[PDB]
Enzyme design. Structure first.
Site, PDB file in Angstrom:
ATOM      1  N   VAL A 130       0.854  -1.181   0.000  1.00  0.00           N
ATOM      2  CA  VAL A 130       0.000   0.000   0.000  1.00  0.00           C
ATOM      3  C   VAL A 130       0.896   1.239   0.000  1.00  0.00           C
ATOM      4  O   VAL A 130       0.591   2.228  -0.659  1.00  0.00           O
ATOM      5  CB  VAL A 130      -0.925   0.032   1.266  1.00  0.00           C
ATOM      6  CG1 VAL A 130      -1.757   1.325   1.307  1.00  0.00           C
ATOM      7  CG2 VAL A 130      -1.838  -1.195   1.290  1.00  0.00           C
ATOM      8  N   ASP A 160      -8.113   3.157  -6.637  1.00  0.00           N
ATOM      9  CA  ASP A 160      -8.362   3.832  -7.913  1.00  0.00           C
ATOM     10  C   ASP A 160      -9.605   3.192  -8.538  1.00  0.00           C
ATOM     11  O   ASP A 160     -10.451   3.860  -9.142  1.00  0.00           O
ATOM     12  CB  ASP A 160      -7.168   3.654  -8.871  1.00  0.00           C
ATOM     13  CG  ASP A 160      -5.849   4.153  -8.287  1.00  0.00           C
ATOM     14  OD1 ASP A 160      -5.641   5.381  -8.197  1.00  0.00           O
ATOM     15  OD2 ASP A 160      -4.997   3.312  -7.939  1.00  0.00           O
ATOM     16  N   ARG A 163     -12.814   4.208  -6.632  1.00  0.00           N
ATOM     17  CA  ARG A 163     -13.065   5.612  -6.897  1.00  0.00           C
ATOM     18  C   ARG A 163     -13.686   5.754  -8.297  1.00  0.00           C
ATOM     19  O   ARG A 163     -14.553   6.601  -8.516  1.00  0.00           O
ATOM     20  CB  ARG A 163     -11.766   6.407  -6.818  1.00  0.00           C
ATOM     21  CG  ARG A 163     -11.295   6.713  -5.407  1.00  0.00           C
ATOM     22  CD  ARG A 163      -9.902   7.281  -5.441  1.00  0.00           C
ATOM     23  NE  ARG A 163      -9.507   7.794  -4.140  1.00  0.00           N
ATOM     24  CZ  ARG A 163      -8.290   8.221  -3.836  1.00  0.00           C
ATOM     25  NH1 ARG A 163      -7.326   8.193  -4.747  1.00  0.00           N
ATOM     26  NH2 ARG A 163      -8.048   8.701  -2.621  1.00  0.00           N
ATOM     27  N   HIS A 188      -0.430   3.173  -9.664  1.00  0.00           N
ATOM     28  CA  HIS A 188      -1.322   3.812  -8.721  1.00  0.00           C
ATOM     29  C   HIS A 188      -0.782   5.240  -8.639  1.00  0.00           C
ATOM     30  O   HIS A 188       0.085   5.553  -7.825  1.00  0.00           O
ATOM     31  CB  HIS A 188      -1.273   3.141  -7.347  1.00  0.00           C
ATOM     32  CG  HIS A 188      -1.930   3.946  -6.277  1.00  0.00           C
ATOM     33  ND1 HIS A 188      -3.246   4.348  -6.356  1.00  0.00           N
ATOM     34  CD2 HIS A 188      -1.431   4.514  -5.152  1.00  0.00           C
ATOM     35  CE1 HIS A 188      -3.528   5.132  -5.330  1.00  0.00           C
ATOM     36  NE2 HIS A 188      -2.445   5.251  -4.588  1.00  0.00           N
TER      37      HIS A 188
HETATM   38  N1  LIG Z   1      -1.651   2.653  -2.571  1.00  0.00           N
HETATM   39  C1  LIG Z   1      -2.667   3.458  -2.267  1.00  0.00           C
HETATM   40  O1  LIG Z   1      -3.790   3.335  -2.750  1.00  0.00           O
HETATM   41  C2  LIG Z   1      -2.396   4.540  -1.213  1.00  0.00           C
HETATM   42  C3  LIG Z   1      -3.314   5.564  -0.996  1.00  0.00           C
HETATM   43  C4  LIG Z   1      -3.061   6.570  -0.057  1.00  0.00           C
HETATM   44  C5  LIG Z   1      -1.872   6.569   0.675  1.00  0.00           C
HETATM   45  N2  LIG Z   1      -0.953   5.528   0.476  1.00  0.00           N
HETATM   46  C6  LIG Z   1       0.323   5.435   1.218  1.00  0.00           C
HETATM   47  O2  LIG Z   1       0.221   4.554   2.356  1.00  0.00           O
HETATM   48  C7  LIG Z   1       1.373   4.851   3.185  1.00  0.00           C
HETATM   49  C8  LIG Z   1       0.901   5.095   4.620  1.00  0.00           C
HETATM   50  O3  LIG Z   1      -0.045   6.187   4.704  1.00  0.00           O
HETATM   51  P1  LIG Z   1      -0.598   6.727   6.113  1.00  0.00           P
HETATM   52  O4  LIG Z   1      -1.529   7.833   5.788  1.00  0.00           O
HETATM   53  O5  LIG Z   1      -1.097   5.629   6.953  1.00  0.00           O
HETATM   54  O6  LIG Z   1       0.687   7.371   6.732  1.00  0.00           O
HETATM   55  P2  LIG Z   1       1.169   7.658   8.225  1.00  0.00           P
HETATM   56  O7  LIG Z   1       2.344   8.570   8.129  1.00  0.00           O
HETATM   57  O8  LIG Z   1       0.014   8.095   9.051  1.00  0.00           O
HETATM   58  O9  LIG Z   1       1.637   6.216   8.700  1.00  0.00           O
HETATM   59  C9  LIG Z   1       2.751   5.544   8.138  1.00  0.00           C
HETATM   60  C10 LIG Z   1       3.288   4.749   9.296  1.00  0.00           C
HETATM   61  O10 LIG Z   1       4.331   3.941   8.747  1.00  0.00           O
HETATM   62  C11 LIG Z   1       5.362   3.972   9.737  1.00  0.00           C
HETATM   63  N3  LIG Z   1       6.646   3.552   9.161  1.00  0.00           N
HETATM   64  C12 LIG Z   1       7.570   4.337   8.557  1.00  0.00           C
HETATM   65  N4  LIG Z   1       8.593   3.585   8.155  1.00  0.00           N
HETATM   66  C13 LIG Z   1       8.232   2.353   8.517  1.00  0.00           C
HETATM   67  C14 LIG Z   1       9.000   1.244   8.306  1.00  0.00           C
HETATM   68  N5  LIG Z   1      10.104   1.381   7.578  1.00  0.00           N
HETATM   69  N6  LIG Z   1       8.554   0.080   8.829  1.00  0.00           N
HETATM   70  C15 LIG Z   1       7.403   0.014   9.511  1.00  0.00           C
HETATM   71  N7  LIG Z   1       6.652   1.102   9.706  1.00  0.00           N
HETATM   72  C16 LIG Z   1       7.065   2.288   9.187  1.00  0.00           C
HETATM   73  C17 LIG Z   1       5.422   5.388  10.235  1.00  0.00           C
HETATM   74  O11 LIG Z   1       6.218   5.517  11.433  1.00  0.00           O
HETATM   75  C18 LIG Z   1       3.927   5.666  10.331  1.00  0.00           C
HETATM   76  O12 LIG Z   1       3.440   5.374  11.637  1.00  0.00           O
HETATM   77  C19 LIG Z   1       2.032   6.113   2.619  1.00  0.00           C
HETATM   78  O13 LIG Z   1       3.219   5.856   1.862  1.00  0.00           O
HETATM   79  C20 LIG Z   1       0.884   6.710   1.825  1.00  0.00           C
HETATM   80  O14 LIG Z   1       1.266   7.747   0.927  1.00  0.00           O
HETATM   81  C21 LIG Z   1      -1.224   4.529  -0.467  1.00  0.00           C
END
Ligand SMILES: NC(=O)c1ccc[n+]([C@@H]2O[C@H](COP(=O)([O-])OP(=O)(O)OC[C@H]3O[C@@H](n4cnc5c(N)ncnc54)[C@H](O)[C@@H]3O)[C@@H](O)[C@H]2O)c1
Ligand SMILES: NC(=O)c1ccc[n+]([C@@H]2O[C@H](COP(=O)([O-])OP(=O)(O)OC[C@H]3O[C@@H](n4cnc5c(N)ncnc54)[C@H](O)[C@@H]3O)[C@@H](O)[C@H]2O)c1
Lengths: 327, 327
Positions: A130, A160, A163, A188
């Site tokens: 993700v 996606d 949505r 994505h």
């Molecule tokens: N693929 C999709 O459809 C999609 C959509 C929206 C967001 N995202 C992505 O999902 C990811 C998480 O988003 P979020 O809003 O929950 O962010 P967030 O910042 O609230 O949480 C991310 C968590 O991951 C932790 N983390 C960082 N490095 C880590 C590691 N190396 N190992 C384990 N844990 C780790 C952080 O400390 C944090 O608590 C982001 O990269 C974001 O952009 C993906």
């Protein structure tokens, strides 16, 4: 039945805050499937203490299916015997941070997590990435896990997909659940290509129903592509809850089956539709018995080839930028 | 079946962020029950725009049960024909703000919402108050709705209940789902009294199993009573997700039935156990056919009477402080 071990990274983060409770409630693997949660966060005291707080809340929900739950700060213990892994943790992009900086920061996370999975996870673990860039991060992990089957590494294109589903329903005035054969190709990212050419509603062509391809090009595609920005502009924060839902949809459909229905999954290309082998790409698939199958024989017109070429090129740019970290 | 209209206040807030998605998923009224969501937020542009953002996310989940969803800034339209209402919105306590200031601020919210429900909601609407002070806010609403049945106004004590359940399971090493006859008396506050004297696990006495009443007094009660603070100290923020879960548990059990099982509900006292009539109080109840029934005949020892007296007195202090706003 026997509990499945589910490993989840970035556990003290936002997406996981909406995700963990729904998995424990049994939305992901079935109401009859007990689960063990192995949660991972960075070693830092603040993140670990927050992860402790989230676990307290999970216990306070009294979920009958939660067979166990442990916290980790090391991917080597977190992925131990894991049957399923949701890689949500990733390095976000900050101020002054260039694209090359983003790719490398994440490459270094995923090569390590990939090796860890390779070493201690179940020999047939199902992996879903993700964390952004999803497709590319999934590619790094896959490449970093030579002993595991490559088809087990997927990226989430389901948000996606859902949505796109939402916009079509709103446009046709038809229930979101009546829409069939809609899917998304590619990365994505805003370059994703929601294809509505084969979508049907009650056996009727959605494309002919709308009968306005200009709507498709200048309204439908741009809206889905920039939906995340629209949510951040409205709430002030990212779309955590819908992303969590899409992740559940992804694993649920993969493991339980789509019963003939088509869906979207970012999977390693086997060469279908001229997509280079190995590239994690959004493809229309059907699932059954825990396996997926790319829908073959779709026609690719000029417009589609141009959209596919754009999303493919962005993916090749990302791959070129992390290539030096692999090996 | 025919869709039920569910009105939810404080819709752009944290508890609702975990709540709305689970209701739309069908966790609250059944997987076969379509729902219409009438969401309410304060008139302010910022809150209304955020509420718009949350709705965008809900659409992006493609929930088959969501039959409709509207946003409101006026309780008079929000509660229109509502079958169920979850009053989560409330005025929190800020700097320099005294208890009398907190009670009045909330009294003015709930007298208005109560009158609105009285005027436009279903004649047999089920009301649940989550916003703090829960019990007292439920009392104000009830008093402000003379045309509706008083028994339809409840307060959430389910979070205290599930938290107590969690501690017992952890102490006995037994699955949280095997615990029976546990419940909580009183106010949803640190003065709540989790009673484990009749709780059983596999037909065996939990009290005798533990055989250490000192644990009960100096460890069990204080931990459950201060659990919310423990979560805020760990995560930095309130326990949104577990509170949302407890709300779902409350409405779910009330509407669908506990099948003989006992649970905790903050309801208007009918005079049972010496509790003054009208006071919203936590009582052990069983539910069936959308109605609840107070479990009668429990023995109240000296210790229990003292705990009950403390939680009751806090409630009478709160009632005295809002009495002037009623009428
Ligand atoms: N693929 C999709 O459809 C999609 C959509 C929206 C967001 N995202 C992505 O999902 C990811 C998480 O988003 P979020 O809003 O929950 O962010 P967030 O910042 O609230 O949480 C991310 C968590 O991951 C932790 N983390 C960082 N490095 C880590 C590691 N190396 N190992 C384990 N844990 C780790 C952080 O400390 C944090 O608590 C982001 O990269 C974001 O952009 C993906
Ligand atoms: N009863 C329990 O078990 C329990 C447990 C924890 C918290 N709570 C309480 O639940 C309530 C909400 O908590 P939260 O964390 O979601 O808070 P929050 O501040 O994140 O959200 C509250 C939302 O209510 C909105 N609101 C304010 N006045 C409103 C009004 N008059 N009408 C409609 N909407 C209104 C706010 O604008 C805000 O968006 C609080 O009073 C909180 O202390 C209850």
């Amino acid at each position: 039945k026997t509990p499945m071990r589910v490993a989840v990274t970035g556990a003290a983060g936002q997406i996981c805050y909406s995700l963990l409770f729904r998995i424990a409630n049994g939305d992901m693997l079935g109401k009859d499937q007990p689960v063990i949660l192995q949660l991972l966060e960075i070693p830092n005291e603040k993140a670990q203490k927050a992860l402790q707080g989230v676990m307290m809340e999970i216990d306070d929900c009294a979920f009958p299916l939660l067979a166990g739950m442990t916290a980790h700060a090391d991917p080597m213990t977190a992925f131990k015997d894991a049957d399923v892994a949701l890689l949500v943790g990733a390095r976000p992009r900050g101020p002054g941070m260039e694209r090359k900086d983003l790719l490398e920061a994440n490459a270094q996370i995923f090569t390590v997590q990939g090796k860890a999975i390779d070493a201690v996870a179940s020999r047939n673990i199902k992996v879903l990435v993700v964390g952004n860039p999803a497709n590319t991060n999934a590619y790094i992990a896959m490449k970093s896990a030579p002993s595991l089957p490559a088809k087990n590494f997927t990226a989430m294109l389901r948000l996606d997909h859902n949505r796109a589903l939402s916009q079509i329903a709103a446009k046709t005035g038809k229930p979101v659940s009546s829409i069939e054969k809609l899917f998304v190709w590619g990365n994505h990212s805003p370059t994703m290509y929601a294809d509505y050419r084969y979508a049907q509603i009650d056996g009727a062509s959605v494309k002919d129903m709308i009968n306005d391809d200009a709507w498709n090009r200048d309204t439908f595609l741009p809206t889905v592509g920039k939906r995340g920005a629209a949510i951040i502009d409205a709430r002030g924060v990212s779309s955590a809850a819908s992303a969590a839902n899409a992740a559940i949809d992804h694993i649920h459909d993969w493991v339980l089956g789509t019963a003939g229905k088509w869906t979207t999954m970012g999977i390693p290309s086997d060469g279908s539709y001229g997509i280079p082998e190995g590239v994690i790409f959004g493809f229309p698939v059907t699932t059954e018995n825990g396996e997926y199958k790319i829908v073959q024989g779709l026609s690719i017109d000029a417009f589609s080839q141009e959209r596919i070429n754009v999303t493919l090129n962005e993916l090749l740019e990302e791959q070129n930028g992390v290539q030096h970290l692999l090996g």
